Design a protein around this ligand. Structure first.
Ligand SMILES: [Cu+2]
Ligand SMILES: [Cu+2]
Ligand SMILES: [Cu+2]
Ligand SMILES: [Cu+2]
Lengths: 123, 123, 123, 123
């Protein structure tokens, strides 16, 4: 299955946001990170990634197509807006092993607040 | 301003969901609840509602337009799916006075889990 | 099946638009006409409606839920923006009997231009 | 500014479609072609392309970012689905000089039908 996440200046969820901020996927799924507005990208939060998953960083304003082969939690940020809390979360498969890592990973205050909100969706 | 909330059997956020689950509005705004899938309605959570706001309960499968005049937090539920956690939150204006009431309001376990996730967006 | 049409001030398709501007449905389907921005409504174009279908006119800024029980073409307009060409088209079922009526119905110039574009999608 | 086009097996506009099928842009904009479904790509229609614009052909299932520097009409096709009418149109800037070329360019019957529908949006 394929999923889409938008990068936005302003949504219902606030300023500098990924929407949806949480994606539930299965191994082999595709996630498309697509700008709604200019100025954004997507980059892996290294401390919120499954084992063996390479970091990634898209170019500003480009759609980025991520295949989530490995199960677990994938945290993402927008590079210039990380401090403004622009973060998202993808859960791939059941019972993610890196839940604790995601709860404790160091990041800017607003990013941690939004990541904590996203973590509430883990199922 | 207008806002839109979809009533869904399933979304990225799970089963039986309002998407978006959080809306940020100002007095005079309208929020449209849209029957994207059949089987849903929208009903006020009486304990999460500003003073002077009349309760409401729409008919299954219909659109409902909520005009928010009074500032504060408005909690909403889908009647048949309340236990399945189908709840949403509208913040109207800055500095909502009823944050505590929203934190403590009694509801089914999954509803409380989802309301806690939504409350994290209050700004 | 349920379908959604947005009412917008400005889309890729221009100013004062329904998007999608064409919906392909089957008898018994539901179409939700939902504002993206304030100022819009949806109203039937009386001369583009199947036999026996009652006219409808939504209130400004409200989501409107239309059940398309009868087969044929349904033309819609936004009341205040009809002259600005804000029109849409729903095809319900195969081989619509009112195709000629839709091609010849009198309306403002910009509405006719956009209706002609929509009619190209009839299948 | 950014723009987004989805590559779809099916949409309201039919089978094998770009949605939106028409994009209005300005020089310097980017257009992201998003693999919402698998099986698609984006390729320039050589006869509908401004002067000095290099041809392009993306890989199946990938995102593609088109930077539009030169003004005029850019026609695009999906390679495997060209005969199925999977074509799109980008207008860059006012008063495009190559409208006639877009009207007459040779292509499969269904592609010409869909391109004629798209050309109706040129402004
Ligand atoms: Cu950003
Ligand atoms: Cu429900
Ligand atoms: Cu209008
Ligand atoms: Cu294709």
């Amino acid at each position: 299955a394929t999923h889409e996440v938008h990068m936005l200046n302003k949504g219902e969820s606030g300023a500098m946001v990924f929407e949806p901020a949480f994606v539930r996927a299965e191994p082999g799924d595709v996630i498309n990170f697509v700008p709604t507005d200019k100025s954004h990208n997507v980059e892996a939060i290294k401390e919120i990634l499954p084992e063996g998953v390479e970091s990634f960083k898209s170019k500003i304003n480009e759609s980025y197509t991520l295949t989530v082969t490995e199960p677990g939690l994938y945290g993402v940020k927008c590079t210039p807006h990380f401090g403004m809390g622009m973060v998202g979360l993808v859960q791939v498969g059941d019972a993610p092993e890196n839940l604790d890592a995601a709860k404790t990973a160091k990041m800017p205050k607003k990013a941690r607040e939004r990541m904590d909100a996203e973590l509430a969706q883990v199922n």
